[PDB]
Amino acid sequence: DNTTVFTRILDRLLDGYDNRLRPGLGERVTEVKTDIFVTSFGPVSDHDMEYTIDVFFRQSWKDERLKFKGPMTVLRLNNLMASKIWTPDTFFHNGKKSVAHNMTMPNKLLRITEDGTLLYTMRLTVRAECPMHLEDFPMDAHACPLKFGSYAYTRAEVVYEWTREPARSVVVAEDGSRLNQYDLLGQTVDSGIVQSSTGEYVVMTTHFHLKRKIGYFVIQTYLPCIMTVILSQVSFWLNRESVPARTVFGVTTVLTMTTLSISARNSLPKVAYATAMDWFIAVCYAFVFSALIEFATV
């Protein structure tokens, strides 16, 4: 019995409800309040120019068709109730491939207040494309954006807004950061408008500022290049008589330098421009060549 009153309330809510029509389809604008909690900022793949991110995407709006009065003020229903009511069709403009996690059940929660407010959260992983300029590689910083808006609802029908102050509406968990060779300095949010053929839409923008860590590359390339240059120099102090030793210096230095030059390029994607690493390698190669030229002169 005690469960029957709530069943009656839920049945009363749904009857005569058309989930094909957005709230206030005639007069007003559905104003969706958004919010993000980033449980982990995933790895950044410079080769594919993309990053992964895991979030608790929260959306809230008001639906006057779902007002109720009963013993409790807030209803905490399963995730199969959200398929019966109308919900906004948000999507990520610059996303590549996302998953809405489904184990063990759909990771969604719906909560209905007695005044008709809805809170709709869901856990999902996003792979978003992040354009990168690698001229200063590996001494470079990036701002990887995450833009989302509505599919099929222009600004005249659905408008998004941040739940709290825009500076506090994207929260990054303290312990969640899966970045290996990057540092997350901070984030900034902006809200704008985008024009398209189908109409004019609202876009919520978030930038995550990243700075690359140079520790790996220093040991990997820079020190080996310096040591190869020094070994190439060593040839000067050798006695003039021992020609084969100096020839061996030259050949081994040039061979290892070519191998290092090949190795360095695979660390980043194919780009027509030349990175700082390439300039350093070229200058060191020029120094080796100059040592050989000075050898020939002497």
Epitope: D115, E161, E165, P166, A167, T188, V189, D190, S191, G192
Partner: antibody, heavy 116, light 105 residues
Framework: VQLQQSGAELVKPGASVKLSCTAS????????MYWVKQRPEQGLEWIGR????????KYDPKFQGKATITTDTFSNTAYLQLSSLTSEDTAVYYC???????????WGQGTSVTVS | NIVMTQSPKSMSMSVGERVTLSCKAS??????VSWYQQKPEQSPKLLIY???NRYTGVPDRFTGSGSATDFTLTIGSVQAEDLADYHC????????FGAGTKLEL
């Protein structure tokens, strides 16, 4: 649509007082209420705000402790309470709404506080 | 926390001349700036919300230009009834306001 703020008042120094901001044409539960103080011939100063849906409040560091903001959701009004009033607190206090990109679209008529 | 500096502190001209007001943010506020005008013995009125959007019931004379930190308000063909203060405020964080600009004559 309209915010009917309290009338003018006079308070002796060192006392405490409270101000009301009645709201009509909408439910305060849907937005944030703001309190702004404007000393004569100076720029506006933000006091604090309240989220009526759950009573969460944030205050400007200067006014921390000095002011307390609460909402009577049933009567649909917000309250500002000033304590330990001094002679530099005499100003005009405004009650402001929020909407459309956090712009303070609507304002009250302004309430005058005078300390002798 | 975020300081908003309005320049000029005061400036004036005759009716019809183009007038521009400049407000600059100490830190980044991404188009969450607003402009209000406060007539004497009156409460502020919202003029421009967002960086550039024009509030309903506002003449097309007013226009706002946005940026990350540098914002401006231009009143093309100022009339003789625009003789009120002008406050720039940012809402990216807990709201703050500029010192205001006085417009006379």
């Amino acid at each position: 649509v309209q915010l009917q703020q309290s009338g003018a008042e006079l308070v002796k120094p060192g006392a405490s007082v409270k101000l009301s901001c009645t709201a009509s044409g909408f439910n305060i539960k849907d937005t944030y209420m703001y309190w702004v103080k404007q000393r004569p011939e100076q720029g506006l100063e933000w006091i604090g705000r309240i989220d009526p849906a759950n009573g969460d409040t944030k205050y400007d560091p200067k006014f921390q402790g000095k002011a307390t903001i609460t909402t009577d959701t049933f009567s649909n009004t917000a309250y500002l309470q000033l304590s330990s009033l001094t002679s530099e607190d005499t100003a005009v206090y405004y009650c402001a709404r929020k909407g459309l990109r956090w712009a303070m679209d609507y304002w009250g008529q302004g309430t005058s506080v005078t300390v002798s | 926390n975020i300081v908003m500096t309005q320049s000029p502190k005061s400036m004036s001209m005759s009716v019809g001349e183009r007038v521009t007001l400049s407000c600059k943010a100490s830190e980044y506020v991404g188009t969450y700036v607003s402009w209000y005008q406060q007539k004497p013995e009156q409460s502020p009125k919202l003029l421009i919300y967002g960086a550039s959007n024009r509030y309903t019931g506002v003449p097309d004379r007013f226009t706002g230009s946005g940026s990350a930190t540098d914002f401006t308000l231009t009143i093309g063909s100022v009339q003789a009834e625009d003789l009120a203060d002008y406050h720039c405020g940012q809402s990216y964080s807990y709201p703050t306001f500029g010192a205001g600009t006085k417009l006379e004559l």
